[PDB]
């Protein structure tokens, strides 16, 4: 099963429920299969979704973990979303 996170500019990001439930805030906003984020543009949310993939793959890895990459021009908006979403 998947859920749909919609950005402030209309983009529709469709990610696995299990990944999106990592965020307690998104759990609360689903608890119902879509979430509209009026204040997160798609260049932030696309990065959020990548972090979902990254956290699920590299949590509990004895292998080497790679840095999660953040371009400087996104860093401040990503921070604000991450602070809101507790992520």
């Amino acid at each position: 099963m998947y859920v749909k996170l919609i950005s402030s500019d209309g983009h529709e990001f469709i990610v696995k429920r299990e990944h999106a439930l990592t965020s307690g805030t998104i759990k609360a906003m689903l608890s119902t299969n879509e979430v509209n984020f009026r204040e997160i543009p798609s260049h932030v949310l696309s990065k959020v979704c990548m972090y979902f993939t990254y956290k699920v793959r590299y949590t509990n890895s004895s292998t080497e973990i790679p840095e999660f990459p953040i371009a400087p021009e996104i860093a401040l908006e990503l921070l604000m979303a991450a602070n809101f979403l507790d992520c």
């Binding site: 998947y2 950005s7 402030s8 500019d9 209309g10 983009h11 529709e12 990001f13 469709i14 990610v15 696995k16 990944h19 543009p41 798609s42 260049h43 696309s46 979704c49 990548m50 972090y51 979902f52 993939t53 990254y54 699920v56 793959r57 590299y58 790679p66 999660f68 990459p69 371009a71 400087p72 021009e73 996104i74 860093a75 401040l76 908006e77």
Partner: protein, 103 residues
């Protein structure tokens, strides 16, 4: 090996993963589950190159090196209406503000 993908059409973006040995057609099945469109009504592209149903995602250039969790490869998706496929169209993401002078 798992490959990590964004499947993109219009203002739609699917985050999913697949085996390198998986087929283009089997990916079309994945899409079929999310978006409810049959594979015969779907085209998948790497950049602007149409991909063939029998080829593995590896032979289409999706690998551990190029399709990572924190940097997934993009697969273009185009739908067929009335027995005529629309052109590949992928709307870009929003644009970042200019970097603050403080940075």
């Amino acid at each position: 090996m798992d490959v990590f993908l964004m499947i993109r059409r219009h203002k739609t973006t699917i985050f999913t993963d697949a085996k390198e040995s998986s087929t283009v057609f089997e990916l079309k099945r994945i899409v079929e589950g999310i978006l409810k469109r049959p594979p015969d009504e779907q085209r998948l592209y790497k950049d602007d190159q149409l991909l063939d149903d029998g080829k593995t995602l590896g032979e289409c250039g999706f690998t551990s090196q190029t399709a990572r969790p924190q940097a997934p490869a993009t697969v273009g998706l185009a739908f067929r209406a009335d027995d005529t496929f629309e052109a590949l169209c992928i709307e870009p993401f929003s644009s970042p503000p200019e970097l603050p002078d403080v940075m």
